[PDB]
Enzyme design. Structure first.
Site, PDB file in Angstrom:
ATOM      1  N   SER A 260     -29.754  23.398 -37.174  1.00 43.22           N
ATOM      2  CA  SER A 260     -30.772  22.608 -36.499  1.00 43.22           C
ATOM      3  C   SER A 260     -31.556  23.506 -35.554  1.00 43.22           C
ATOM      4  O   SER A 260     -31.126  24.615 -35.217  1.00 43.22           O
ATOM      5  CB  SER A 260     -30.152  21.441 -35.722  1.00 43.22           C
ATOM      6  OG  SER A 260     -29.296  21.925 -34.703  1.00 43.22           O
ATOM      7  N   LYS A 261     -32.721  23.005 -35.125  1.00 48.40           N
ATOM      8  CA  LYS A 261     -33.519  23.712 -34.128  1.00 48.40           C
ATOM      9  C   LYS A 261     -32.723  24.007 -32.865  1.00 48.40           C
ATOM     10  O   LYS A 261     -33.054  24.953 -32.141  1.00 48.40           O
ATOM     11  CB  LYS A 261     -34.772  22.903 -33.779  1.00 48.40           C
ATOM     12  N   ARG A 262     -31.680  23.219 -32.587  1.00 48.01           N
ATOM     13  CA  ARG A 262     -30.801  23.519 -31.462  1.00 48.01           C
ATOM     14  C   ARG A 262     -30.150  24.886 -31.622  1.00 48.01           C
ATOM     15  O   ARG A 262     -29.930  25.594 -30.634  1.00 48.01           O
ATOM     16  CB  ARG A 262     -29.734  22.430 -31.326  1.00 48.01           C
TER      17      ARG A 262
END
Ligand code: MG
Length: 495
Positions: A260-262
């Site tokens: 994820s972008k996280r």
């Protein structure tokens, strides 16, 4: 016999790495088999539309080198290639499916559905509109035929839902995931047509895959729980389904879960191929392209997220990938994203670029840092530095001593590394300042005196750089020139 695949992104934001990979495997599969690669824009969910998303998709595919054979930009035999423009086609097939026992009308309002959702939640359950619940809701199965007639006369809004069969075993066969079975009792009466007559993605995609003569649907495993529905929709329409291949989600670099972008924000790598500015916040996520990833290296990295060519050759061109791509060799297991591997690929490709190919971006980096040098010197600096660089910008950021004199000197290096030897070196360098002749002069001085070459080279490196780094010292001296070399030496002597 002609293979036809389609990339079907929605115009709802930027492409993620998973979407780039799906598009790539579409392209490789089509080109490997001499078939067609279609771009179909999934823009029926008007309220999730993000301006510029179609343009973003085309720009990203163009950057990587995977131009669709059929698309809104190129046209094609099955246009329109935007689903928002296909309403008359969808109306035809809505009329068709309503003649079957696989569809029904549902009149439930959002408030009524929220109410039954809350009833289930209070029992610790999750509501599903399905065989078990449809008879206590408001639809053409549960309501008397006279009440349905009344509601339609009153122009009551309705959706069209799929009627999930009772207790039926669906036997599925996926190219990636293999054979598996699903009982329809685990599935829901999904909405096929919204209040306004436009289909949901489920119905629009089976209609358009049929109409566009798609043979192989390659997509992410987020769609796998809907595969039984899709196969049942082809049956409801009297049609043959295409083949399916479901790609497992890309995994996080470390730990459990999916990428994820996280992970990008926590580890420092990009998540989109190109810059994307979020319209809600005005903040821009820098893309792979703008961060200096070479497109050939980028797409080589993406290809290897779950595919390993039988020859175990990691570095491959697009043409080589087309020649050897085998969808039956894509792994069922998820693949972990690796920032290390992405940077390694970039380094491998950068090292093989000519100095001239690197020069335009290098000159751009120099200009951004208010530095100017001759093209002759720039090419020589690129040649001296590119073997160690991961990105073109590293050639400047790790080579600032080519353009700026040291102001201080590292104490540890200063202690590890006399002015008389340096003064004597200053006198000898007044010649054709070429690296080969400078080193020959330094060796002549060391041989003439009684010291090993490092006794001259190491304090000289400190003088020119401020620390013990950089390329070979005679190469650095040639780059900065006689006057600047002597200036830095005298500055170090005075310090
Ligand atoms: Mg298989």
């Amino acid at each position: 016999e002609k293979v036809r695949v389609r990339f079907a992104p929605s115009p709802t934001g930027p492409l993620h790495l998973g979407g780039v990979r799906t598009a790539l495997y579409d392209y490789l599969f089509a080109k490997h088999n001499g078939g067609d690669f279609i771009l179909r824009i999934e823009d029926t969910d008007t309220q999730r539309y993000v301006p510029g998303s179609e343009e973003y998709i085309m720009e990203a595919l163009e950057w990587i080198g995977m131009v669709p054979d059929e698309s809104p930009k190129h046209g094609g035999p099955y246009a329109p290639y935007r689903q928002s423009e296909r309403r008359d086609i969808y109306d035809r097939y809505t009329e068709q499916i309503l003649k079957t026992d696989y569809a029904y009308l549902a009149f439930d309002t959002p408030e009524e559905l929220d109410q039954i959702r809350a009833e289930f939640e209070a029992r610790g359950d999750v509501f599903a509109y399905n065989y078990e619940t449809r008879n206590r809701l408001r639809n053409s199965i549960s309501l008397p035929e006279e009440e349905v007639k009344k509601l339609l006369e009153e122009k009551t809004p309705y959706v069209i839902r799929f009627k999930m069969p009772l207790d039926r075993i669906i036997n599925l066969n996926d190219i990636i995931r293999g054979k598996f079975s699903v009982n329809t009792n685990t599935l829901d009466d999904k909405v096929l047509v919204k209040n306004d007559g436009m289909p949901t993605y489920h119905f629009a995609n089976i209609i358009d895959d049929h109409e566009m003569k798609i043979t192989h649907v390659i997509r992410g495993e987020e769609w796998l729980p809907s595969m039984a529905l899709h196969v049942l929709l082809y049956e409801a329409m009297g049609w043959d389904a295409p083949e399916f291949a479901h790609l497992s989600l890309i995994l996080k670099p470390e730990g459990k879960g999916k990428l994820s972008k996280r992970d990008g924000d926590k580890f420092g790598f990009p998540v989109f191929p190109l810059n994307f500015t979020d319209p809600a916040t005005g903040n821009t996520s820098a893309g792979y392209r703008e961060e200096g990833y070479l497109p050939e290296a980028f797409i080589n990295m993406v290809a290897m997220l779950g595919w390993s060519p039988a020859d175990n050759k990691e570095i491959v061109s697009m043409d080589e990938m087309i020649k050897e791509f085998d969808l039956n060799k894509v792994h069922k297991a998820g693949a972990r994203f690796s920032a290390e591997k992405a940077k390694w690929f970039n380094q491998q490709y950068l090292q093989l670029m000519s100095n001239e190919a690197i020069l335009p971006e290098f000159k751009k980096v120099l200009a951004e840092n208010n530095v100017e040098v001759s093209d002759e010197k720039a090419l020589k600096i690129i040649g001296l530095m590119k073997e160690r660089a991961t990105f073109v910008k590293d050639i400047y950021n790790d080579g600032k001593f080519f353009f700026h004199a040291p102001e201080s000197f590292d104490e540890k290096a200063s202690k590890k590394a006399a002015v008389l030897m340096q003064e004597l070196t200053e006198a000898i360098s007044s010649l054709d300042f070429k690296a080969e002749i400078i080193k020959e002069s330094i060796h002549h001085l060391a041989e003439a005196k009684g010291l090993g070459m490092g006794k001259v080279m190491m304090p000289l490196r400190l003088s020119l750089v401020g620390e013990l780094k950089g390329p070979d010292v005679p190469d650095l001296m040639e780059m900065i020139g006689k006057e600047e070399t002597i200036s830095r030496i005298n500055k170090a002597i005075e310090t």
